[PDB]
Structure formats: C-alpha cells, structure tokens
Amino acid sequence: VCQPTRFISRHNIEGIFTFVDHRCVATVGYQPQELLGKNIVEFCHPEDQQLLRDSFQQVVKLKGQVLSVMFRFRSKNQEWLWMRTSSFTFQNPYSDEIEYIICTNTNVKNSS
C-alpha cells in the first residue's frame, strides 16, 4: 500500500510549534527549524485560519479525545496543500503542568 506522507508535531495551547518531526521535509518541504517557534496558523490559508484557531481552542476542552481538522497548508514551494491534522492533548497526571497538544499532520485529498 502507498504510505501516507505525514509528520508529528507538538504545540503549545496557543498553536506554536514546540517540536517538529523531520518527516516534515518530505510532507511540506520545510526543515523543522523553519517551523519551530512559529504558530501553525502562519502556514494556513486565510480562509482556514479561524477554523484552525478554533480547533486548537476546542481540543483542550475535549478531555484528551482526538480532534481533526482539514486545512490548506502553504508548502515550501508556496503551494496550498490539503492537510488533515489530528490532535489531542497530553497532560502527565503525576504533575499539574499545563497540557500540550500532539498533532499528526497528513497530506490528504479534498475529494471523495
């Protein structure tokens, strides 16, 4: 089977990339360093940015369940690629440290 192209990222609750898996180079064409420290919304099509902000806001309310969102991500070649980001929060209950958001980001088709 043809394997999906995807990469993992960690974000703070605001959406800033705090960790980026190197599989991002093949998925969207950027080096991890080009994403780290930026908000995911900075790579998102203007029509999708608010949905993406809403999603990050809601995943924290959903009790560690998975949220997904589909949006247009600007690749390194300045082309809009459809991405499906599936996100969930992680909080270590030995602590009261703030949860962060774990994402898996896959290039998908906007079609049936």
Next chain:
Amino acid sequence: FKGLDSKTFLSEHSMDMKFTYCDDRITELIGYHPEELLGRSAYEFYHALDSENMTKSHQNLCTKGQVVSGQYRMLAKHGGYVWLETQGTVIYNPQCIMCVNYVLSEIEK
C-alpha cells in the same frame, strides 16, 4: 532526578504495532536509536510477565480508540528493563497508533 519532559518520549506505530517513528529522547532513557526500532513490533520489548496484560491493552486500544496502559516493563537496549506507562491513541483516516510513553524507573537488571 529528571524533569517530566526528559522522561517522556512519543512513538508512532502501524496497526500491526510495528514502530514507524520514535522520539530521540528514547536513546538517553532506554538506549535505543529510533532507526533501529523501525519495523519491530512493540511486543518484542515487553517483559514476559506483562505480555498477556499488554495484549489486552492493545485489544482495548483497537476497540475503543484510546487506552492508558498501566505500569509495565520495557526491555532496555543493553539488558534489563525500565518501568513505564503509556497513553495510546488510534488515529483514523485506522491509520496509526500514537503513544506517549513516560518512564517510571531507572533501568533495573
């Protein structure tokens, strides 16, 4: 003494439980290089006394979509075992399993 993040590593698995990705943090904790884990099933690494319970947890994960593992022992690269606990999540397109792994002990030989 270590902080929380230094004892946490994320792994990704295909639905056959084989590693498809692992955080480099695992090297400092357990000894493995991520590249050497790829294509090996999670089951290769569980202590014998935890194997039946882990099978049940994997079954619960696949049935329900998420699971918390309880405490189990993972085989360390240079012998011995480390206690850890895992939160597992299936990502459905099922595409893969994400595991957040937290180390609970030093390596015990």
